[PDB]
Design a binder for this molecule. Structure first.
Ligand SMILES: [Ca+2]
Length: 123
């Protein structure tokens, strides 16, 4: 953790507290996620979820019996641009890329506050 991810979003969105703002949004942002993404931000989340699902099927992780949920990488934040550290092994670089793409996706999409705390039956 979360923790690294939380730190990435803030790097692109310095004004936010991502565990509060990007949590429980739409159908996908937050625990699980199903149905059709309700907006571009939901789709950001749908993708990220997908990128974690894929990471688990990766050999490089499947050792290192890795958990996307616990995957431990390094990244730096400078001037609101994120760089995933070369020192990452393949598995941790895959996860860092997942987190990186989401960070960025989040900063380019509209925020629809009618989609926070949605009834998943709309999903
Ligand atoms: Ca999700």
């Amino acid at each position: 953790x979360l923790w690294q991810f939380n730190g990435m979003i803030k790097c692109k969105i310095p004004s936010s507290e991502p565990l509060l703002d990007f949590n429980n949004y739409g159908c996908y942002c937050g625990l699980g996620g199903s149905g059709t993404p309700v907006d571009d931000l939901d789709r950001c989340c749908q993708t990220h979820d997908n990128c974690y699902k894929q990471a688990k099927k990766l050999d490089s992780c499947k050792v290192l019996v890795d958990n996307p949920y616990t995957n431990n990488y390094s990244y730096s934040c400078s001037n609101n641009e994120i760089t995933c550290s070369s020192e990452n092994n393949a598995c941790e670089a895959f996860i860092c890329n997942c987190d990186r793409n989401a960070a960025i996706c989040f900063s380019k999409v509209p925020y629809n506050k009618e989609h926070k705390n949605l009834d998943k039956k709309n999903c």
